[PDB]
Symmetry: D3
Subunit: 250 residues, 6 copies
Amino acid sequence: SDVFHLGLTKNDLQGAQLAIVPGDPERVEKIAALMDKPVKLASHREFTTWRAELDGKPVIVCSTGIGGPSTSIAVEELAQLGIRTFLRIGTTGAIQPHINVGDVLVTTASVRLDGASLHFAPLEFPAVADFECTTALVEAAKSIGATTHVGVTASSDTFYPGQERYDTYSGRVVRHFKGSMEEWQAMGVMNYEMESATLLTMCASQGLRAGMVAGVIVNRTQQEIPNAETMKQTESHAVKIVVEAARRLL
Amino acid sequence: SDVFHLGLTKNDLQGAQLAIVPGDPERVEKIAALMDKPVKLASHREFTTWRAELDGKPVIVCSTGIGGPSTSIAVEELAQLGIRTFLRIGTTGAIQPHINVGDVLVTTASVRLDGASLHFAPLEFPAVADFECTTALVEAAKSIGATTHVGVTASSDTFYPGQERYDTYSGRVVRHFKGSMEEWQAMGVMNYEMESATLLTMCASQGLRAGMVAGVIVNRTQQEIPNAETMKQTESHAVKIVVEAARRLL
Amino acid sequence: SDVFHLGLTKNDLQGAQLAIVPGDPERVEKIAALMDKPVKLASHREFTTWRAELDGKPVIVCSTGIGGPSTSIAVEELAQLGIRTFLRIGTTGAIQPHINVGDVLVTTASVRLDGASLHFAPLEFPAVADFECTTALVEAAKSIGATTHVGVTASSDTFYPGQERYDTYSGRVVRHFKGSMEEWQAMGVMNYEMESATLLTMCASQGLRAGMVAGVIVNRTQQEIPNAETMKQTESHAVKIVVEAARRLL
Amino acid sequence: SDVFHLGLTKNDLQGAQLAIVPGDPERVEKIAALMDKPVKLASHREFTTWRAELDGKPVIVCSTGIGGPSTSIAVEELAQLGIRTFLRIGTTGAIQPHINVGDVLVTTASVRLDGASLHFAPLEFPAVADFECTTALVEAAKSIGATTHVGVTASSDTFYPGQERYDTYSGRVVRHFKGSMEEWQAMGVMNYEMESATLLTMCASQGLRAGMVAGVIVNRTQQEIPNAETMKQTESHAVKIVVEAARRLL
Amino acid sequence: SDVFHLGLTKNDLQGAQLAIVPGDPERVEKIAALMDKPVKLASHREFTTWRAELDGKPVIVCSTGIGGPSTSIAVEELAQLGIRTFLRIGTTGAIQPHINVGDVLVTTASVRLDGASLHFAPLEFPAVADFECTTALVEAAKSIGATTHVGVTASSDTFYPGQERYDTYSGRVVRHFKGSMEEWQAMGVMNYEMESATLLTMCASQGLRAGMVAGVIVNRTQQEIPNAETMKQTESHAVKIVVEAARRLL
Amino acid sequence: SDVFHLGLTKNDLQGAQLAIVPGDPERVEKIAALMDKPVKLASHREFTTWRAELDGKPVIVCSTGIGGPSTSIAVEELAQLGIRTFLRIGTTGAIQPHINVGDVLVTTASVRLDGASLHFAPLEFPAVADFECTTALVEAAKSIGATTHVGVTASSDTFYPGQERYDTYSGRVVRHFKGSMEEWQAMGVMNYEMESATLLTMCASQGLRAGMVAGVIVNRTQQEIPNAETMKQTESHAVKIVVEAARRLL
Ligand SMILES: [K+]
Ligand SMILES: [K+]
Ligand SMILES: [K+]
């Protein structure tokens, strides 16, 4: 390997300068299979990587794992192997009443509820997306007729207390986080997830382009349990959007 | 009057929902004059307000004064008077080598080197521009052929120490600010100015739309005294840009 | 001009080493007109300057605008032009029940609810007034029989949320500021305003003398609407006090 | 499954109350295999879970992925599934001259260079190991004659800047982290790793028991490329230690 | 004197490398008198020092006064005179319902509610005890049949507001501290006292060994007034434990 | 006794409402002796209390020990016992070139380098002296012809690292404190001491009056070993000053 974690060589990438970066390794084969000539490159720890081709151009798909720490590894190592553009795709829970299940969120910038962003820029630095990547994502979403919200996302180093989930072992939330979600709701924040503050801050502060889309699968203000077809249909739609954005940035 | 500071009543605005917000009271008339039916409404403190008409629609132009405090009063009072979108326009000094004088900077989000933004949202929240506004400003730049850079601006509560100026009374900078400029330039920041971290935080956190454009009059990494002619011309080009963006946002 | 903002030359000051610094430009002519041979020097942005003479000595009156940012400009530039002593005068809202409308507040030091003070000294540094200027102000107030409180003032980068005003567009206050006024009341804080934390910290940390007086025009614990005569009578009384303090510091 | 991420049900665990928690999914089977009746339970995301049996008692081995976020999800979900004690085992780089490769480090508490710990307790709370766990790990080290150092570990949300690595894409470290390594070495810290400040804070703050052991594979103060053979052997020695401690904690 | 405060020479210590450090000077003679050949060395300010012998080895007893500031003096000066191991003993109030009057607390690490610890290590550094000293203390306690809790202690720079005592002059607690005790209770914290965050952080970050035991004299969750015999009997028992730990560390 | 620490009852004080508060128990009698009817009341821990009589009025003199923690206990307990004004007196080291040994320093406010002040008010609140007290101390200095400097003092929770002393066990200073002394001297600070940020914050935030005077025994910028005679004489001059101020504040 040319890098410490990913198990990849420069030649494995065949010149790729753009990576789609889901958190879940299981989505890597899915996205790559939407593209031409998908081939599996490597799988180690949370990092599963495939290569494919889009409009005759090599593209990478690599999973980040959950959270800023493993994200910052994947971005750092892909950057050493020539990746310059990074497009995160996921599914998410909305926290505003006007967003519906099936809608699409494009993130302009994130609230930094994480640790890793601080290892690249102090807190006053904005966790902002690349304007070209944001534009390509909104254009792609509107091109397939998605209902699309564009705005702020809160990025948390935990799934449970930092998103004020109380159905947990302890059933309590530390003082600093208790009531925080209602603050973020009043401030127009669309959703929570767990990798964009790191992704956006580290890319923006190092001349790398990054952006983020997500399919809404639950609305925590009007919460319904999703069935599989809905999770699949929402996942597919965000995957289609992200590939189409990638076409526009190649 | 209907507000504590600006000396304006609601009917003065005639239904206006967009305001162009320079810092300098002097620039107010310069902007009004591009549009139809310019009328001075009020001059109180740092706040000089004219109204004008663009494609048959009332637009406001209202100066903020320098700094987040006076910006916050102007935004809040204009919001009480029906303004939902706010476009800042300045002239500025670049801090990157590749930016040139007479280039145009559209800001996607700002480093929060201010105090007033904290009065709307904790430090982790990003001082992010509205996507529609930022798009309209990039497309408006392209519509007069400007050379445009899209990226992060550092927003400082001081002109002197916070922007690491040493030709001062004391000729010193406090430890926290000594050497900050090099860190911001490493992280790709384009320029400093003194109102945008306030303006973008308070608007993104309350569902008002905001955006910012500036014209470059000096490049601190290759610093020349600016020509009287260049400054006027770059000012006028930035002025046109922000009016044309207004036009696309009505 | 010899300075970037104020539009002043060294010779304009005729040797003045003391400036009275109200926030409102409209008060500049008023104060200068209490003195001998008042002449208008310049007016640009929030900075209106007049020169006069007191006991045959030149004095400056210059407005700061609202907030620490424009304040720090005015102080910095007047310091480059030879001002060493700075006496802020305003009118204010009391936040304690024992203070009455018409009373006078002299500030010993301020709670730093601002951004600009931090560009001169870290937060643990006290925003303290000059002992000679505080003494001259208390002596002057007692000399005309004022009822005078001497103590702490909270200095905020906003007029609205940082002074927990709720009659606003959003009608809400960010978590950090919600309930803060009742903390400041329990701690004996007399009032809020918006320039002294910057003024005091930047002067105290640079060998410059500064102090602050204010006339009480509303008591927010027993709030009455003032009529014009009361605002005039209160303003006049604080103006008389500040000039008389200036006599004692010349 | 009974939890959002791990894909496990309660009955899967068969009454297990202790979990051994490596970062790397690959190490899971290596640990399981020391014990009786190894059975792979699940592989999802970074979380690979086996069960095994030690002295007739069900034990879990479940990988956390890299970093506090994925560690927090694994700990919370395993706690919902009856796990009350959690032992981490890694391999690591020393940062003290007197530590040698193949030595063993038992951590008493960790420097909190992470974000997820903050989601359980404010920064002042110590990221401290459970005394029973730490004792069992020291005595377990002594029971195979290991050379053991007992002390503080620095726990970083990044592998690269937070551990002051400069052989990177950018080759720079942000100001706050530049020169931190020398300060930690002055203060006697032994090593860096990427999960323990999360793991120990969240467990000490909720009455779960946690502890950590690692084997030293590199000494950054006298840095040698590690031998394939040494690494396997030190890994196996750390693995044995954490199983033997488990044995004393059942 | 060889030191600025303690009034001690190197020869006064006769080679002692271990000090027992109570806060109260009155306890110095008490502890020393449990040992052989106790002699009074000096008394200045809060620093009372006696020397004795244990298993034919010289030992020091020196009082710290209350709080991290005077503690950091006593530790610093005893360190210059050859002390390497420091064993704090006190009596305390429990804040958990399961701890009884007469029980013994051994502190693994402390919540840093103090100022002085920060003059030795930033807040993310754990205020952790020496493993050998913690072990010797637990072994000693169990050796005389004590009921012993081992875990976290909150160390506060005040007796009153930082331990949320309300029977005071003002009867109020600053916002930051109001409700903090119920946070510390939920997090398993055993008790409050006022010197260990400083003691532990400063020793751990400088290669010095430290530990802490306390006898429970009141339980603030089920609060009873103690009589003298109980305070004596509890004090004696902690003194016996600390001397016996000192025997094991000599 | 009526309080937890000081061993005093209310009637002991005979109606006293002012306390003079040295750090050192030894100085207590030295101060008492200037006044009429000196009587030792109590000695417990660092707290030595005498009463005396000045112009027929009971005054208390009570030592605080070193540091904000023990100062906070003394102030709170004396406040429970009717003390409403508190004057500190020390000897100190200057950190400015123009100050001379045997000069007198009256403190207007303090840099908050302590932890206990935070237990009364957040960091932004100023550690400011009471105006009546400070005036009485300046006029009292003038009444014996002392050379007086009026200004800011840095108040440190440590004697060694926080005051940037390097002739220590470790001979090092943590990063945050390394080079702080030069910043304080730039900002005009006069001296360091170890109780005033506590004393002034807790009193200004609860409506008690406080003030501080000190005599200069060493000038760290031109450092000489102090003469036994000079120190006694400067101590006595500071002692007289604080008694004479007491006299003007009764
Ligand atoms: K991970
Ligand atoms: K202004
Ligand atoms: K003390």
